[model samples]
Target: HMEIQVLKAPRAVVWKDFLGVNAQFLWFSPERYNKQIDRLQDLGLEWVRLDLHWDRLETAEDQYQLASLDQLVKDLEARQLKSVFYLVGSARFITTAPFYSPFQDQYPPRDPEVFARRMAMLSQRYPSVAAWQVWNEPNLIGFWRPKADPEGYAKLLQASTIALRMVDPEKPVVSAGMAFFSEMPDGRTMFDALGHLGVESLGTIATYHPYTQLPEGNYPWNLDFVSHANQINRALRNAGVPAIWSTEWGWSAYKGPKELQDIIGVEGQADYVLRRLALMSALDYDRIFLFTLSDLDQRASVRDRDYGLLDLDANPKPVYLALQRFLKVTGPKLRPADPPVTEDLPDGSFSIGWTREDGRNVWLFWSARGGNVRLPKLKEATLHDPLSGKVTPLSGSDGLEVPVKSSLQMLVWE
Candidate 1:
């Protein structure tokens, strides 16, 4: 154990609105719905996110085939699981595709008004939805077809916002999760895209996916997770966007090539997931939705398979267990008593203090490199290993010696 002290506590406090997980409901079978939803409930999660593809909902011009989606939304609501459904892509009849194609949704709408009308219809159709994400990864050419055009997207967004609000004014409209580092074709960038969007076009809650290839708080030569998020938030807020949310962020526990820095093993995935959740909650993100809830398939893309908290068979992964344990203490309504404090101690560690609705104090500690983390001693403490959900009692001390390593740990007391 190392001695770490808190000189002062912070004045401002932030309550976590939601810690959500993104799920590919379309890929899984309907029979698996209840089990997967139960998995979300088991983690004590209050929110779930799904990509509601436009083509799937509106097959033709005004023909809507909502049987599948209606059932899923109904089931989710029945279990009290609020949702942020991402309305992505264009329907076939209105697609910008040069010719008839199966992947019509990849293209933008020929008429943005048509798309906006569809958005309004969906807004009214699923009034129980907590929010609606306008699109997904519009910064990337793959998602925003033809090319990533900031102006076109701004037009689409403004039209959608206007139409959606006509139906439900108070409903939160979320901007697309801009892939922060992805560059648009012709040398444009996310910043360029943000420059094109006016306040009226912007969603009430602006969103971006911060997928830093390194650990959350310990990036040395690279932009760490939170800093990347800060950069996005700063740019959007400066442009008059009200609030920021991390619509998608995750570490893939792929057992593939380790050439890339982003790839991590199962244990590291668990550690990084918990750290990201803690940091995001403490830093005041309106919501933080992990990339996915369950694996899509055995032979799917690496991201489709490994980013999930559970495997395709619905078995819990190490990351799932870690989040379950971490969330156990800091949820369903935990607020930061103070913003996280950083220490220039040996090996670089991080800590944040949180207060639950019941008024219990919970402190999370972790380091990039394993080290003895020093902190202010408490009168009584219980050490929580977030990875394993294990608890151990601690004696009071003036200078608490907490041996915090790369993995996240929790300390709690009355």
Candidate 2:
């Protein structure tokens, strides 16, 4: 054997266990819920995440009322979809109602034991809900206002877990989605709840929301924390957890809050759909839930409510078609490949080679910072646009000179 330096290869980014979508329904409104779920299923989404807002569900102080949730669950189970329920606030707001958390910020219920009992009771009632998220984004000021204390959050989580175990020991529990991309409750500055709450204390899967872009429409860096694996995986690994769930991540297609030049037009939204899916899929995450299926009254607040595949009126945007392209037309189910030899091609483009089980190779080509790129010679490959579902015969010269824009391109080597 030659005494040559053998370079170690980059770890292949493939699915660890599974991947799915979250249907962020605005309201549990029966009539609206009925119509949109049809479109959601038709678009091939399997897992649907609904909520279990207890204050709204509790009829009296002791009795649980879940009429709306019951109907929604029935709608999902009757079809190809399932459910992921999150414990939320009361009907009106997080006020000093003495029933739910105090108005300061959505915190643990006034009585931990009572809150735990209600969780068990609810779990027993809806025995079919696939999983339960103890609370919403406790790390964010918007959801949890009184400074988002981790100590109280951990207590609430621990109490809920013990109760849920008493009732339904099988269903999985997801932690309050930790905020990563936003600065309101930046993950870097704040204590890492996933790292802080060991599995025995809090949750099984480490969950967080990594929104793809900023309010002004486009931001290249995923806050530098999520750009590389080592940074992203450290929290979960350090906490002795295996899986990660991206519960909420999306980019809004808004001209601006009032068209203040924050324009990421409908077309951009479509491209970001593929871009985000591909990027997040490359990680060792379990489920990546899209922010929403439909917009929530887009007129009031474009920045907050406009992150939807469909418009406020529930019409399909180009982004929805873009999602269908990948979910329906082209599949991203990756195969085992040889060590990827990354070629930093001309015009700021890079191509990674992956080998298939059938002895062929597939190349995923894209630009690093979202710009125009001309890939090196890609001969005899089928050019597949994961966003548009466009397939073209790749000749020696034409495919080699294709423009590599912000979007990603997949090539199946023949």
Candidate 3:
């Protein structure tokens, strides 16, 4: 006989490399789903975020088809990819019945409890699923029942969480990803809107989508982005939730002026992704899943879906190469950065720094208005220009001085 042992560590320390993707298997054609799995593996990702469509599962009352989903689960296991399955039983956009059989009922029987029971059944069947999300973006009109009602969604969350836990106490349950908050007519941010909706009642890991537009005209590197994240963290902590995860985050790469699109040109997209990844690494988030792996024609109307790293023809974008380079430079492990502070200069500029595990420094310096900026002290540094495999060396204790044009520079030290 063989013996097994388990180890304990801080939640933050235990779940660091949980980097994965928010894969939309429900929307893809059945023919292409397996290909998508293979491609995801090719990208060096081992985790996937998938959706369980209740409407599809129950085509008739008390009837279900496990063949397709079973095949998918088996294939993911074969590929060695762990899954984060989002159980989506209710959404306003898709009707439920014989036309849409599994839609919520008119009263209590129609409540989320029934849906939870179904999910519990599924969970019991598929023990490999890592986590279960309550629904799709619940704070959005397209997904929520009465148009972004937080309290109603909270009920759904509570029901689902309880049911799933009843089935498997070890598996974690997560809230639906919230759309990025913006200034509402009532002067409430998205976070405030969620608060109004009573997000506190349903206890689960906090999750949201934070997708910010690129620097074009007046919008600079707003600290509000980080503030919004901190606010979510604060809310979860107050609600007694442990940590949060960003299920979806990315910029668009569409046909537009080169300067306007953040994910358009290869270099611009690469820099944008690298900077975002570095920032997230610095924050030490629990888990971060980029929006998607490939562009979807159905979502073309939505600008953000264009934020994929691959073009429609499956071509690799510069941003994809940038991520590859980032993984190459900083693999698996990330150390804390020193003097962790954000400064808004008198001339409308900012600088951020952090120390890597090897005592090296990683820094980013940018200005709202173009000008020269002095960098921090470092003995040896390598500037990875993803555009080319060029490594610009900075040698001297006084530190490297670089001109800040309309571009972002990344610095790593030894």
Candidate 4:
């Protein structure tokens, strides 16, 4: 194992920035909204990405009710929290059947024009909203209708963009965050299909859900595991969309050994998350929103749930603590790493490092086979363990040697 170290500034000079959280309003009970807000604040989060389901608002044709939403916005403002509303008007699972409203098959809007008008009305009505996401995962069959057509989505995008811009040109209109995968057996990449249908022609900040399914021994910080994000970025650049946002990214704590469930246990999840966050810091992304803040009802089975920072009962998981530790040492000002490069090791492992603007250094090492790591030398390096607030010191000129029993390790040095 390679001992990792991070140099730090005097206790007085560390800067603190607001860490953001994603709030799934749909899964939250209307009565528990306030409680959830308080819980989030307690976790040191200041911003929320609130998802607004279109099915809820479009219960009736052309009838927009602000009763439920008004309460939500009011609560958010009362808490002094900044919000980014995701207007999810269409989703395959939620909209596949006619259970919800705005069922195009049943209550066909006079045309895309009317649909755009409805969206425009809402945008003009709420200036508090930072941005409007036109739809939700239109590229995936599970998210789009059975006969999901990219052209139809493009029309929706065009109409909505025009209408929303007419109301608030300053507010950005974001495209639906497409799933990471672009190619299917049908001989088409989602991006290519969307582009073929002229969907990419729209002017907006391209967004996508870049989710990576971790291998059994993998940790959260695998730098070589960024193919999905890189592919998305390449597609966006090819389409002429300069900027992009990772609307969703995260890992579930449910996998791995039961004993290693805490920060010290199952270190892979923590390692992976830390690495991913560091990668995002290096990217030119405007913002990266983790999939969710906490777990929700599985509906089918408890095991089927998606990844979250917290468990269903609102308990902070090991990954959460790991993030806190990283933030405590780095404090948000990320400087470029010295080597400015990344590589995969022989044992299916990888390493990447970064320097804090304030002079502390952080490096992430990952491996599939629990291998040995040789630490690099630093003047004064202290390992800040999140599980235990104790800062372990490092000495000796011949680089510290540490053995990694898990898939990942996060090291910080001054």
What are the Cα lDDT values of the candidates?
0.72, 0.59, 0.60, 0.60
Top-scoring candidate (lDDT)? 1
**Highest TM-score among the candidates is held by which one?**
1
lDDT of 1 by residue, 1-414 (tens): 653322112223332346788888777777786777788878767678888888888888788888888887787788798888888888888889878565668888888898888878887888889887787888887788867878888878888888988998898888788885445666776555556555434556777777766556335544265555556556766766667778888888887765344567788788888877766666546667898888777557765578888887788889988888777766566655642333445444566777777788777776657666454545567789988778887664564555676677887766
Predicted candidate 3 versus true structure: per-residue lDDT over 292-362, tens digit per residue: 76666764565545666665555566776667665555544544444222222226444446554566665
* Residue-level error in angstroms, candidate 1, position 58: 3.6
TM-score of each: 0.86, 0.79, 0.78, 0.78
Candidate 4's residue-wise lDDT over 1-414, tens digit each?
Answer: 432222221122112232466777556666556666666666555667777766567766555556867777766777877677766553222233465544533222325676677678777767777677776676665555554566777777889889999998888888877775545446666677778877666777787766655532234454334555556667777888745776776665554343323322335556566656655555545666765676667551333253556666666667777777667666556555642122223254545566767676676555546655555554345555554455667554856554443333556765
Query: Which ranges of candidate 3 are over 4 A from the true structure?
Result: 1-18, 26-44, 89-109, 182-202, 215-218, 221-223, 256-268, 298-305, 312-315, 339-350, 368-370, 387-389, 396-398, 403-408
Judge candidate 2 at residue 193 and give its lDDT: 41
Candidate 1: where is the Cα deviation over 4 Å?
1-16, 60-64, 100-104, 181-192, 200-203, 217-220, 257-262, 338-344, 358-360, 396-398
- Each model's backbone clash number: 6, 0, 6, 20
Model 1: lDDT to the true structure: 0.72
What value does the lDDT take at residue 251 in candidate 3? 68
* Ranked candidates, highest TM-score first: 1, 2, 3, 4
Stronger candidate by lDDT (1 vs 3): 1
Name the lDDT value of residue 310 in candidate 1: 88
For model 4, the superposed segments whose C-alpha errors exceed 4 Å read 1-19, 29-35, 38-45, 89-110, 215-224, 253-272, 298-306, 339-346, 385-391, 405-407
